Amino acid sequence: TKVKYPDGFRSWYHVKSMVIQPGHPLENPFGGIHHVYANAEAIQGLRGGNYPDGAVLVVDLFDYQEDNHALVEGKRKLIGVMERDAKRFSATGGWGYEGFGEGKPDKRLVTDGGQGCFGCHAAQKESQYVFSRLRD
Amino acid sequence: TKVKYPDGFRSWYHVKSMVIQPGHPLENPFGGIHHVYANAEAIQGLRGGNYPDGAVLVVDLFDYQEDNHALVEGKRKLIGVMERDAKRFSATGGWGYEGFGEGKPDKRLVTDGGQGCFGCHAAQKESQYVFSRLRD
Ligand code: HEC
Ligand code: HEC
Ligand SMILES: [Zn+2]
């Protein structure tokens, strides 16, 4: 019933990025430069296939610094993790939701079984609760 | 003596990202959100080894739109490509430098055999002409 730390996620397929700046409704706590990653099973889902159990999506959130008309990556703030298990995570739509502070396996963040995460992701029911779209 | 189009680069290792905003000295043509990718060979060099022949670094440059304090990736502007061949690219320090407009193999951007690219990358001679640092 716990989401595994997605060991090796930095070697996975980079789906997309986005910057959330001060003023954005999600600045707290989603502020920063984020990178979405997908394991092979998650790519099958993202391509328009179905998500197999064992699909993992990671959102990797960095602080950034302003550096002369450049936003430069600073320290990692956290990672968000969605792990597909249709039966074990059925209460949250077949994805298990976890956060790791600074991306550290020992800093698990979620305290409500992921109901808060799922509450926002539920808007994306028709893309199987995933916001990110595969781009070329 | 032409750099090959790096087919499949989107499936490679994501090294790092950066945003270059308007007013940056390199705004033309490096303005946008960029993602650096490395093939397996290039990872050896980034980890502290010698870059082997066949190492390829790609910088993938997107337009973005500031939409309510989110920077949102738009169309791809171009890719920059560095291809390691100590002998074939000896005039430019063993890297071949090329750009592909909109990331399309038929839109080559470099017109000076990469001397302009090399002129700036030469400052990084001590890190084998590569600016990007591997981060976890
Ligand atoms: C709305 C108020 C959200 C809440 C609460 C949570 N997330 Fe979410 N997440 C949200 C958006 C708008 C996006 C897309 C970002 C983009 O660049 O397009 C995401 C994305 C993720 C991802 C990546 C997969 C995807 O659905 O695109 C993961 C792995 C993820 N978020 C995890 C996650 C967790 C663990 C949360 C609770 C701790 C959480 N999110 C809440 C919107 C919102
Ligand atoms: C200085 C005036 C530059 C010129 C001219 C060119 N490049 Fe360069 N490039 C520059 C910097 C500061 C960076 C690092 C960006 C980052 O996020 O840290 C880069 C990076 C690249 C890369 C990625 C590999 C690396 O060295 O980090 C590639 C593949 C690359 N640049 C290609 C490229 C080409 C093809 C150029 C001539 C058309 C070229 N660059 C010019 C600085 C400068
Ligand atoms: Zn200025």
Residue numbers in the entry:
A (entry chain A), B (entry chain B): 3 to 138
Study authors write:
Of these, cytochrome P460 (cytP460) is a heme enzyme that oxidizes hydroxylamine to N2O as part of nitrification (1), whereas the evolutionarily related cytochrome c′-β (cyt c′-β) binds the diatomic gases, NO and CO (2). By contrast, our recent crystal structure of cyt c′-β from Methylococcus capsulatus (Bath) (McCP-β) reveals a hydrophobic distal pocket dominated by two Phe residues (F32 and F61), a structural feature we have named the “Phe cap. Proposed roles for cyt c′-β proteins include protection against NO stress generated during nitrification.
We further probed the roles of the distal Phe cap residues (Phe 61 and Phe 32) by comparing the properties of wt McCP-β with those of the F32V and F61V variants, focusing on NO and CO complexes. Our goal in characterizing these aromatic → aliphatic variants was twofold: (i) to provide further evidence that the Phe 32 aromatic quadrupole limits Fe(II)→XO(π∗) backbonding and (ii) to establish the extent to which the Phe 32 aromatic quadrupole influences heme–gas reactivity.
